[model samples]
Target: NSVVEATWNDVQLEDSLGMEVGYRLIPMVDFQQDGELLGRIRSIRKKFAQDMGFLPPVVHIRDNMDLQPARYRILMKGVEIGSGDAYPGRWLAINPGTAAGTLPGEKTVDPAFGLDAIWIESALKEQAQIQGFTVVEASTVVATHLNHLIGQFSAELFGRQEAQQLLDRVSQEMPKLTEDLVPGVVTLTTLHKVLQNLLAEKVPIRDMRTILETLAEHAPLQSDPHELTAVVRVALGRAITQQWFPGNEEVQVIGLDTALERLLLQALQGGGGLEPGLADRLLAQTQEALSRQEMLGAPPVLLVNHALRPLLSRFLRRSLPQLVVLSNLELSDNRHIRMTATIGGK
Candidate 1:
């Protein structure tokens, strides 16, 4: 997949940002008439790779006649996940939550965030803005939507190719491959899996230097990638803690009661499995605590003993993708914690 072959000729491929546009939208990509979608996506790739420490795939674009003239869709690994329509010679007016109520136009929901939006005529652009609607050009709509989708699906796109590229960038330049690739450590595939797990949990792997150094030591004891993720998370404890509880801010979190902790410990110590009965009760209680945290406008981070972090994370991910499960070892000692809710294994 790193190269393209046509008519017995091979060509190097760059695929960081991929897109499918309607035939009518050629001028925009052609860059002769308000066209810069390709360039815009390239900028997004640069910013993401520089900021996140991974090379994004080059964007692949082709005209799609099946799509409506003014319609566009975003694809992840060739699967369409998001789409929207934007009329040329018009404005995409969004109700950015600060505007004066809704405006009269062809109403639609923003593909990026599902916010209320309207496609108003060019003549009405002034009115839309004066009314406080966040107006953006047609190309901007598709670009923003695709960029957001990339972040959302990076976990899936980050495969062995991307991982090797990331490792190459770090090692070839830093000359630290010898120390970084310690013997008996997890393979690159496993490390990629663990990193993807973090992204799926909405955790950022921005600080890779710390991540790789940490994995070198822990990967031996934790052969399983899931277990490895937890250990690396603890290594990134302070960074992970700061994301939810920034600066010196105190953290109000959910904790497990002494009885519940003992039961979980036995499960881990005895057979490394969370019993069905206990898991059922744990989910119900955790859901209730999560509800309270949401109601109080607190970050959805549940703090538990280091031993229970991995189990709780795997269990909760089924129903709560937004909830961040944090073990005690994942938090900085200076950050204070108040147990707003404690769960017992009823």
Candidate 2:
């Protein structure tokens, strides 16, 4: 038992970007060996570090002849999360919508976006683009897929070490507040929980100053990570809303029926999961609601009361990750609320 648990813990060791490229793709990672990919990957690392407010993994790459010659696998902490075959001398045409007039080639699906795609010779690139396809080179195909995978697992990649790194970076510049707000006010674990909660929902914690200031103000009163996360969410409300709505656009969202919303609020106060029947019914309604959201070409969002936001988010995240749960506090008063659909009708 101990060994098995230890093995699991070992998987949680240092996070790094490790990729195994088929021998045919060596030129992508080796400058001395005719590879131009290493430079582009380095640029991605630089841009991500600047945008993410922390250093992402360096993306170490190695050649593996045992695998298919055109295959590449992206790994995090030694576990593969994404992999695909890239043609060394060809282009991949990605069509986001229907590929109505796309040219004939080796049919494939976009590894990152799941769009209709085809691998065609470099000569067909211009025609594919003229046909409204998003054309990408083999090197770009590998890099784009890896970039999406990294963003997908950014939260899982974070740990106490990442938290420490962020803390250390902040303290070097602003020693006073960083010192007080960290272990002095809230423990490092609590801080990570707050940060990780945001990350899990795809929120980038780039604004260190605002986040730390919010923690400094609220940590003395609230030590629970859940409540603290809620406080931080409110603090980062504009950033969160801007992600989906963008600019002053009206918020179009799905809403829970009055009775369903009330039941969720009760569940929050009781500190319990929903009952079996209600949970089943709730999931089904929301699933249909999501289908409608897709049909309408609107974002998948559920606007609920503040008290029900966290609970509903946790409840639905497992089965429906595409849906975003928001609270009234997160929505700006000036922006009108347009209900695209309502789940759990009376």
Candidate 3:
């Protein structure tokens, strides 16, 4: 027998972002085993940086024995946001609403887009592709699902640390402007709030110059983040318009019925919440209109007056995150909008 000294050190058990996999899925994320998902995660972060204007924290990978052998789950701030299964050495054949034929395999849904899919062996991959199925390796399923979830929760992903880092990066290019802004013009807290508001609506914050300048000009007069966000959105109108309706082509979008628009406008100006029945009616009609717009091959965008944009956007955001709410003022002068379907139409 030998005597030994015992030492204890505190070790944090969780990270801000993490991806946990079950035992059977270990090879896909194991570094020593040359995991395929490791490379995919790196590229996903890079792509998110390019698309979302800043780099999110790299995710920690760990194994959870309690999970199903082929399952994996993504967590943010120690909370589960998404989970899915992946079979190593097998391909997922997804039917993107255009697949002509089915394959012999286990039917399931693509966790990323909820598209119909099947899991098939490598020997059937070529045949699945020939039948018009979009085939991808197991690692790709996990990567794509993670990418989608990241974008969905991007607003929450940006915290105080990220805000400071973003400001630091802007300082490198525009030192004078950065020095003048921040606490002097608008507090970092307010800036963070405005950025989060924009991100919540899925708007790109890539152009910090416009966002900061707008804040510098408006924050002193209007201390409210919501009001400031509206002005900044107006300032970013050109980019917003180009984002949805690229080129000079006429844009076709869903429209609000005239009487409904008038009623909503009055309700907004009068300062009381809409009637329960009226709210339900509006939601149902908008849903139907959105479906019609999709069938007509038009974007699921609702074009309304600037005064009503925020009201409708926030009201509909929870139930219909896929719909984009735009104001008349947000449209570029060169572009034109035509209503393909009208909610609450006669």
Candidate 4:
């Protein structure tokens, strides 16, 4: 009972601390409001510090500047007891609102800013949709098919030049087929066509047909068809042919395999319960096998299947790959918005 009581106390203390920190870092507040409050407190502190002959609170002042005037004024009022400079007759200034009178332009609030903001939101939504579609399509067709291709190529039936030739042909053909499609549509259609052509050439026609059908079903759902196509192209590029392609020469097969092996070793060392030294031996063998130039052959769908199947299986077991893709897509969309905002402001 004494131990239980102590445990309960510790749990309670942790919970209390968590709640306190969570409240301190509350995530659900209006940025404008928070900015204003922060600004006011900072202004007062700076004035007080300046009066006291010490360096002003830099953080407070910097944050305060970002706030809309109304929030800044509110913060100023809270710290009124402290010495702070106030903008006379502009205490309640805010953009597109009561504060407009204080600025030189006195520009009327434009509803278009609000509308423009929606475009970013819509773009983000579209990015997520496209990412999901691309990940799913790639997983099914390219990743799954690569296993057999890799096995066949292990015999080195086709040399490095032959593998590169195959990839180049597909790359060349894809752009041509989709050139007539919509600006973004071409990227996707081209990728689809390349995959279709490759599968038909290397694998069974029925299998290629099925993969194409699946891709077609998901294509319409993509928000940015072009981006989705690009993603697929990248995935395809990664899966096939060990040699360096034109645009992606930096990512050689040996490098990727080495990286993966290193990551696996690290994972194992960090309490992952794989047999001791097994990872190293396997990595060394793989390195040995892949090191010989003449031993390597054509880039095939089966090669991609073997390379990614294990990782994809593991990923799928733990979490949805589509959701992971969507998260990244959303991040990219936000980054694009920030870029646009910075450019526009400039």
Write down the lDDT of every candidate, Cα atoms only.
0.77, 0.82, 0.89, 0.28
Rank the candidate models, highest lDDT first.
3, 2, 1, 4
Tens-place lDDT digits, model 1, residues 1-346: 8565575346535454456777767767775565567777778888878755666777677778988887776666666777777665777999878898667679898878888899888778888899989999877887888888878777777887887777766766566742447334668778778878877776777777787877877666677887778777878887788788978877999887987788777778887555577667777888888888889878878888888877778788777766788888888878778988778644
* Top of the candidates by TM-score: 3
lDDT of 1 at 267: 71
Ranking by TM-score: 3, 2, 1, 4
lDDT of 3: 0.89
- Per-residue accuracy of model 2 over 1-346 as CA lDDT, tens digit each: 5645455646635437789988888877786865777777877777767766666767778788888988988888888888999887889999978445858779999888788799999798899988888898989888788778867777777778888998898888888879767678989999988888888887779888888999899889889999988888878888888888887777789988888677667776675655788888878888999888889988898888898888789888877877798888987667878987997543
The clash numbers for all candidates, in the given order, read 10, 1, 0, 21
Compute each candidate's TM-score over C-alphas.
0.84, 0.89, 0.94, 0.18
Encode model 4's per-residue lDDT on 253-345: one tens digit a residue. Answer: 222243544555466446634555744454344334343322554111112222233332233323221111111111211121111000011
What is candidate 3's lDDT per residue for 1-346, written digit by digit as tens? 5365554635466676899999989998999977899999899999988888888878999999999999999999999999999999799999999878878888999998899999999999999888999999999999999989989999999988888898999999989777988789898898888998888988999999999999989888999998998999989999888898888888998888888888888988676477788878878888898889878888888989999998799998888999899889888777776888897645
Instruction: Show model 2 residue runs off by greater than 4 Å.
Output: 1-15, 31-34
Which parts of model 4 are misplaced by more than 4 Å? 1-277, 280-346
Angstrom error at residue 4, model 3: 10
Q: What stretches of model 3 exceed 4 Å from their correct place? A: 1-14
* Model 3 quality (TM-score): 0.94
